[PDB]
């Protein structure tokens, strides 16, 4: 996701932390964050080049189908097993269980960002179009690629048009639905019979890529109201799942 997506996810997560996780997060965040996890939930994107090894950890590539399997798909272009967003979640969650040889501030920042990214449907999608990056279309009147539409445009368009430029408006509406509309689902979202369950989230993601993101889109299309309104609920779902799961995972880790 772009900035707004990670902010929403980390804001949702922050308020669902239990006291032990809230305390550990306070301790692990730098002072410049002023205690706000969401202030640093894009940090991982800002070290993709400084930490060149980290770039493939933001996503998963699959074959041209609607399935994901860790052993088959979790590797980078070099073929190194584990080097995908699911593997990264396993890695950084395991490190945080120690709360060495590792910088656990980075571990927290990585796991927070990656838990978000693994919920972006096109972050678990086809190698053949680089997760929709090579599908060039228009978002209303402006040129955009499909991946960017999912990272940013849908959310930014909702933020402006539907929420009158209040990002807290979308956070608040998601939080209300988590409590009053999706309560049974949320309990399932939180449940993990391991510390982290990223393969569940990736499998949902590739299915969404097939059924919602790629669905109906061709090179050169103009995506506007029809696509926007029909896909917004899935974006809401994934952001909500991301926040709920990030909190549940941190709670398990620090508890
Ligand atoms: C789990 O989380 C950890 C912590 O963030 C990640 O650890 C990093 O892993 C990468 C490799 O995947 C490391 O980067 C590589 O470092 C090599 C040498 O690093 C030495 O120093 C580190 C400590 O900083 C020690 O582990 C040890 O002393 C190492 O010997 C470099 O040689 C590599 O660069 C060269 O090869 C690459 C391609 O392979 C080229 O692109 C480069 O240009 C260069 O030629 C590379 O930089 C990194 O150092 C690790 N950091 C730490 C703190 O340990 C894991 O990757 C992560 N795994 C997941 C998520 O799956
Ligand atoms: C655990 O990991 C975290 C995250 O990587 C790390 O915190 C980071 O520390 C660095 C370096 O200490 C901070 O970057 C500095 O920011 C200050 C702002 O006050 C600048 O003054 C610094 O600039 C100088 O140093 C640079 C060094 O390369 C020079 O290039 C530059 O020209 C200046 O001389 C520097 O940018 C960074 O802000 C934090 N990041 C976060 C998110 O807090 C922490 O130190 C690690 N813990 C360890 C190693 O124990
Ligand atoms: C929070 O949950 C709210 C209740 O589910 C939801 O409001 C509802 O949003 C749906 C769209 O998902 C609207 O349903 C629309 O569905 C048909 C099918 O295309 C449309 O043709 C209709 O016009 C219909 O509006 C509901 O009307 C709407 N319900 C209410 C009471 O306003 C919110 O969108 C959810 N918000 C978040 C952030 O998740
Ligand atoms: N198919 C499959 N499922 C899950 N994990 C896998 C799989 N293949 C390899 N691994 C790795 C991923 C983690 O690094 C490690 C512990 O996962 P843990 O699940 O925490 O024991 O096992
Ligand atoms: C636990 C752990 C995993 N990893 C990597 C190896 C794998 O590619 C990926 C998932 O491995 P597991 O959690 O054993 O994370 C590390 O680099 N360091 C670690 O301490
Ligand atoms: C290459 C690639 C990038 N991405 C993501 C990472 C970034 O969010 C965005 C752009 O990355 P890029 O600038 O390296 O192409 O797309 C995927 O989801 N799948 C891919 O196969
Ligand atoms: Zn992202
Ligand atoms: Zn992206
Ligand atoms: Zn990212």
Residue numbers in the entry: 1 to 99, 107 to 201, 203 to 263
What does the published report state?
AtBFN2 (also called ENDO2) is a 34.5 kDa glycoprotein (the predicted mass for protein component alone is 30.5 kDa), encoded by the Arabidopsis thaliana At1g68290 gene. AtBFN2 follows the standard glycosylation pattern of plant S1/P1 endonucleases, with three glycosylation sites (Asn91, Asn110, and Asn184). While the P1 nuclease has a higher specificity for RNA over ssDNA, in a previous study we showed that the opposite is true for AtBFN2. Structurally, Zn2+-dependent endonucleases present a unique fold, and are classified into the P1/S1 nuclease family (pfam ID PF02265), itself part of the Phospholipase C (PLC)/P1 nuclease superfamily (pfam ID CL0368).
Finally, we obtained a detailed ssDNA•AtBFN2 co-crystal structure by soaking the crystals with a thiophosphorylated ssDNA analog. In this structure a large secondary ssDNA binding site was observed. A single deoxythymidine monophosphate residue was bound to the active site, in much the same way as has been described for P1 nuclease. The thymine moiety was stacked against Tyr59 and lodged within a pocket comprising the peptide backbones of His130, Lys137, and Gly138, and the side-chains of Tyr59, Asn61, and Leu129. The deoxyribose was bound to Asn140 at the ring oxygen, while the 3′-end was tightly coordinated to Zn2, displacing the Wat3, which was present in the other three structures. Under these conditions, we also found a single sulfate anion within the binding pocket, which had displaced the other waters, including catalytically relevant Wat1. The secondary binding site is completely novel, and much larger than the active site pocket. In it, elements from both the protein and the N-glycan at Asn91 participate in the binding of a dinucleotide composed of one adenosine, and one thymidine. Indeed, GlcNAc1 at Asn91 interacts via its acetyl group with the 3′-end of the thymidine deoxyribose, which also interacts with the backbone of Lys81. The secondary binding site possibly reveals a new and crucial role for glycosylation at Asn91, since GlcNAc1 is an important partner in binding the dinucleotide.
